[PDB]
Design a protein around this ligand. Structure first.
Ligand code: OGA
Ligand code: MG
Ligand code: NI
Ligand code: ZN
Length: 331
């Protein structure tokens, strides 16, 4: 079996290998990349997402989210407080202000220490989940706005045409902005490109061990767990690497830098944080290997998770027994 220890793999495709997205994902999996839950892809040196980032300041962040923590330094939840709209230019200035800027540090490791020590005592503001793209229309390879849609993949595998569309999202981050432990909707893949700015550190649990994370989470967030049998779908819980190691949870970590892609694999739990002002673009996607995961994906029906229009059809076709209850939680 390839990659039996479930290590995060890093790939360096040539320009020729960068032409066919589906084929390259399948190549990665042939080498066992999916066992880790997350892979890094460094694009060929000839490639670029767009010419420059000099003209992005007028993008609007309609609902910036202040991420307020509760709990202890290594075991906490976060809620999102809505703030007034601001432009990317305004947000970048805020990120760089003395209140929010990245502290002095020696290296990524020192910064990770400082994150886990001090995250809970600050409430950074995240410009997340903004529909849009920063890829130039003329970028033909690994353009996240031109991938094959999940609806077309389900149609090609299963024969049923469904409604829905699939478009990318922009994330403008600052120091300590945080993504809580989650898998993707319907245990989809995701792909994330860091367009500009400071790094993003990721933590991931191998898919074959995801239930171990779920069991620990039920123990560490006992009220949440009573409220919902799939409360990690709420995307609010954080558990530090120190806590995971103490509880024997298998995981890995990696830092993504500007110009690099990350791919998360079906049922690969992941969490992380931003080092300073940055902008990432991400989208979900599917392959034939996803279908079986989609069929088995847990769902939140307590009402909290509230998701896109396009998840309806996935639940309806792949999980017809669940559909009625899940839709009650949507409505
Ligand atoms: O970048 C972030 O805040 C979160 N991204 C993801 O969880 C992803 O790309 O799957
Ligand atoms: Mg602009
Ligand atoms: Ni994700
Ligand atoms: Zn729920």
């Amino acid at each position: 079996a390839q990659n039996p220890n479930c290590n995060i793999m890093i790939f360096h495709p040539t320009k020729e290998e960068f032409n066919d997205f589906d084929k390259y994902i399948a190549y990665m999996e042939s080498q066992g990349a999916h066992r880790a839950g997350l892979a890094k892809i460094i694009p060929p040196k000839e490639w670029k997402a767009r010419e420059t980032y000099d003209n992005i300041s007028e993008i609007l962040i309609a609902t910036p989210l202040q991420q307020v923590a509760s709990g202890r330094a290594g075991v906490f939840t976060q809620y999102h407080k809505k703030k007034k709209a601001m432009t990317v230019g305004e947000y970048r200035h805020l990120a760089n202000s003395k209140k929010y800027q990245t502290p002095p540090h020696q290296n990524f490791e020192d910064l990770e220490r400082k994150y886990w020590k001090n995250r809970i005592y600050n409430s950074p503001i995240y410009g997340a989940d903004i529909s849009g793209s920063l890829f130039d229309e003329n970028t033909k390879q690994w353009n996240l706005g031109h991938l094959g849609t999940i609806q077309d993949l389900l149609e090609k595998e299963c024969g049923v045409v469904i409604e829905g569309v699939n478009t990318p999202y922009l994330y403008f981050g600052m120091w300590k902005t945080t993504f809580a432990w989650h898998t993707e909707d319907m245990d989809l893949y995701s792909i994330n490109y860091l367009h500009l700015g400071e790094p993003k550190t990721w933590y991931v649990v191998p898919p074959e061990h995801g239930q171990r994370l779920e069991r620990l989470a039920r123990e560490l967030f006992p009220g949440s767990s009573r409220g919902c049998g799939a409360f990690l779908r709420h995307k609010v819980a954080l558990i530090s690497p120190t806590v995971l190691k103490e509880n024997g949870i298998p995981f890995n970590r990696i830092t993504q830098e500007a110009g690099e892609f990350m791919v998360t694999f079906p049922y690969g739990y992941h969490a992380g944080f931003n080092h300073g002002f940055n902008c990432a673009e991400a989208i979900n996607f599917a392959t034939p290997r996803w279908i079986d995961y989609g069929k088995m994906a847990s769902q939140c029906s307590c009402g909290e998770a509230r998701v896109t229009f396009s998840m309806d059809a996935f639940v309806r076709i792949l999980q017809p027994e669940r559909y009625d209850l899940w839709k009650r939680g949507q409505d």
